[PDB]
UniProtKB/TrEMBL annotation:
This is Autoinducer 2-binding protein LsrB. Part of the ABC transporter complex LsrABCD involved in autoinducer 2 (AI-2) import. Binds AI-2 and delivers it to the LsrC and LsrD permeases. One of its GO terms (molecular function) is carbohydrate binding. It is found in: Cell envelope. The keyword Phosphoprotein does not apply. Residues 10-267 form the Periplasmic binding protein domain. The keyword Signal applies. One of its GO terms (cellular component) is ATP-binding cassette (ABC) transporter complex. It holds the Pfam family Peripla_BP_4. Belongs to the bacterial solute-binding protein 2 family.
Amino acid sequence: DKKKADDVKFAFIPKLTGVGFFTSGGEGAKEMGDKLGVQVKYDGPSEASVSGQVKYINNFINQNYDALMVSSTSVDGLSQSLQRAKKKGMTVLTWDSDVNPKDRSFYISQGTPDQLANLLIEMTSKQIGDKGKVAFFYSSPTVTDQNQWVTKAKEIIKEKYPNWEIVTTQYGENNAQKSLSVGENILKTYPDINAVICPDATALPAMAQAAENLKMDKKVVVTGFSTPNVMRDYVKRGTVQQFGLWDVKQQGALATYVANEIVVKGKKLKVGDSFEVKGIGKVKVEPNSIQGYDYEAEGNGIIVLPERVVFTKDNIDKYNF
Ligand SMILES: C[C@@]1(O)OC[C@H](O)C1(O)O
Ligand SMILES: [Cl-]
């Protein structure tokens, strides 16, 4: 091995704290840290901003952390600080939301844009059919992950659902209050809207709540991505019939596991490599091209979760995160 477990520390950084998705991801990363005998600190800003993330990243670098695992608010905004981390000899991973691939080594991904876009579209089309007015409602027009998925989803919709119109795209800024206001405004301005597609953990519950507040629940289809602990009662009331995610606790755990392989065990992971992690399953390192990127380099790539999850009333109580 390259190191001893007790001498290392890893930083697990969310887009922001105080959102169930991120708390649960952090719990998974920390639990795996405990299982491996390595220290993992979960911390980040309380609002989603590039400058906030840069401040935390700089602090972790300056405290001589061995690895950073970040879900990014930006494609390029973290580049300078992540490059500084790499130069210091730190291992830089992303999870959830990627950065420019040259600025990290591995991205621990919940799925490709095609996988996730097809999920959003299929969950919607099962409920509204091939004709309707739809809106997209998510965090921000610049965040890496959601824009990768939505760009793909819009491409698929234009071709495969020519009788859908995307009437609007709105942003809730990872903020519950803003998201509720925006969601209510969608219903007030487009009272005949058929579905709102919400690939953001804050926008989706806000949209469900907006529908309930305005007595449009069960008239408008609301689907997207969020955590089951946040969505459970909306599903049981029937306001949301189905929505998607993936095991975010295992995602955080996988990030810690990979950091441990690299930093403690001294493994040199390459595209094409594969391994198994108990409680997660078999995973492999894929090229950056699976995300649409044009960059490849030795020891750089994407590790995708084996499965995603579609939650309905039939399985909502099978998941705790
Ligand atoms: C769950 C999600 O869609 O919302 C916040 C996360 O960063 C996410 O994965 O994009
Ligand atoms: Cl619905």
